[PDB]
Design a protein around this ligand. Structure first.
Ligand code: HEM
Ligand SMILES: Oc1ccc(CNc2[nH]nc(-c3ccc(O)cc3)c2-c2ccc(O)cc2)cc1
Length: 393
């Protein structure tokens, strides 16, 4: 027989039984990626946390030429160290401050947008597609607002992402085409005097500040493109599959409908059991490092399986159950951990909370309009998502 292949399944509505067997029998073990490369798959909470909190397991070095690869690059290799570059340009604080959900009127904008989308769906009548006509438009509108760019520019940038976040064995020509075009767009945004708010407005000001005279224009455009893409794909995909998790639990749906003050904790649990990341987080060992029973050698590829950690019964008892009163509710790895912890976590949380609150208020009887098995799960993608999410109410 051949070496165990990853990923195991593109389905985001259930965790494979094989994961628990793996965690119990071999919480770090050798696998083969789609490129043919070998890697260590880590699937226990303890070892996942160990790996993510040890910077000698490097994100940046995953971009090195000749390295074993999880998948082909869809960005310039320097972009792999994007946050690092941000840090080096002295821009980390401003960027992070710009993408919090705390800006005046941001949450009200989210609510208004969600409510408008839902009103439109209700007017059009069931069935409704909660991905293409709710979650993703909401994410896109949100990130246009956050970046300070026109709403009407959102869809076209959005249309890069189905390619931008592919997980391919080979390089993707369209990915480079779209990348260069979106980069030209963001550079134009930086030169556009009308853009004075949000992330791009702030970057536009800092660009002309003498304290930043030697930061490259490339980096400025790149922040815009990368944060738009990662933010929209992450919030859209998470919200979609969270809505799936919610729909499959009518009792929770009803409870949250009755006591919306419980919605954030619910969202936190929805975060914990979320399967949106299709692959483990990649890291390259820069030294010989002991992980459980395995001595990982310098230059080897390591994959941190988030659902491995988050469904670990040793950290989250009865892991498959949504429990709103856990003693350790935010200790999941849905936003990663350590050096590369998600800078957009608060915004993602608020996006999901407001989207769910609005949905439950508008569509308290929301349910799937097709049998669960009929959902079409996107393959070889960095996220797990159903192509369409047909619902009734
Ligand atoms: C539910 C929403 C989200 C989830 C579940 C999520 C998940 C994650 C995870 C697991 C990582 C760590 C990846 C790794 O360490 O290899 C990460 C990092 C990152 N996230 Fe998110 N994210 C979300 C929303 C967002 C948003 C809203 C933005 C931006 C507006 C964003 C931008 C980024 C960026 C740029 C990184 C790279 C950090 C680094 O390289 O140090 N994400 N995210
Ligand atoms: O070896 C690797 C390679 C890539 C990655 C991150 N994955 C990723 N795939 N696609 C994009 C992307 C985003 C926007 C866009 O217009 C086109 C493509 C990104 C990305 C890049 C930098 C970030 O800071 C965030 C997300 C991690 C390890």
């Amino acid at each position: 027989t051949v070496l165990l292949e990853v990923p195991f399944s593109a389905r985001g509505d259930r965790i494979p039984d094989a994961v628990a067997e793996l965690r119990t029998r071999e919480p770090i073990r050798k696998v083969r990626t789609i490129t043919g490369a070998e890697a260590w798959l880590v699937s226990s909470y303890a070892l996942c946390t160990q790996v993510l909190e040890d910077r000698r397991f490097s994100m940046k070095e995953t971009a090195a030429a000749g390295a074993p690869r999880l998948n082909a690059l869809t960005v310039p290799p320097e972009v792999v160290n994007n946050m690092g570059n941000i840090a080096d340009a002295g821009l980390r604080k401003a960027v992070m401050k710009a993408i919090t959900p705390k800006a005046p009127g941001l949450e009200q904008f989210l609510r208004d947008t969600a409510n408008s989308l839902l009103d439109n769906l209700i007017t059009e009548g069931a069935p409704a597609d909660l991905r293409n006509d709710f979650a993703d438009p909401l994410a896109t509108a949100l990130h246009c607002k956050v970046l300070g760019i026109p709403q009407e520019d959102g869809p076209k940038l959005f249309r890069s992402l189905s390619i931008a976040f592919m997980s391919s064995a080979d390089p993707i020509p369209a990915a480079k085409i779209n990348w260069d075009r979106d980069i030209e767009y963001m550079a134009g945004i930086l030169e556009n005097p009308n853009i004075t708010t949000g992330l791009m407005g702030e970057l536009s000001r800092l660009r002309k500040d003498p304290a930043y005279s030697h930061v490259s224009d490339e980096l400025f455009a790149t922040i815009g493109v990368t944060f738009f893409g990662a933010g929209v794909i992450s919030t859209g995909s998470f919200l979609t599959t969270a809505l799936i998790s919610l729909i499959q639990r009518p009792q929770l749906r009803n409870l949250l409908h009755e006591k919306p003050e419980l919605i954030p904790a619910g969202v936190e649990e929805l975060l914990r059991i979320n399967l949106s990341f299709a692959d483990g987080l990649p890291r390259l060992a820069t030294a010989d490092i002991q992980v459980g029973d395995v001595l990982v050698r310098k230059g080897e590829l390591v994959l941190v399986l988030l659902e491995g950690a988050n469904f670990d019964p040793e950290h989250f008892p009865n892991p498959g159950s949504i429990e709103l009163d856990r003693p350790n509710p935010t200790s999941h790895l849905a936003f990663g951990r350590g050096q590369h912890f998600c800078p957009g976590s608060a915004l993602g949380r608020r996006h999901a909370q407001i989207g769910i609150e609005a949905l439950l208020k508008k569509m308290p009887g929301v349910d799937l309009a097709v049998p669960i098995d009929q959902l079409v799960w996107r393959t070889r993608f960095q996220r797990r998502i159903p192509e369409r999410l047909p619902v009734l109410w």
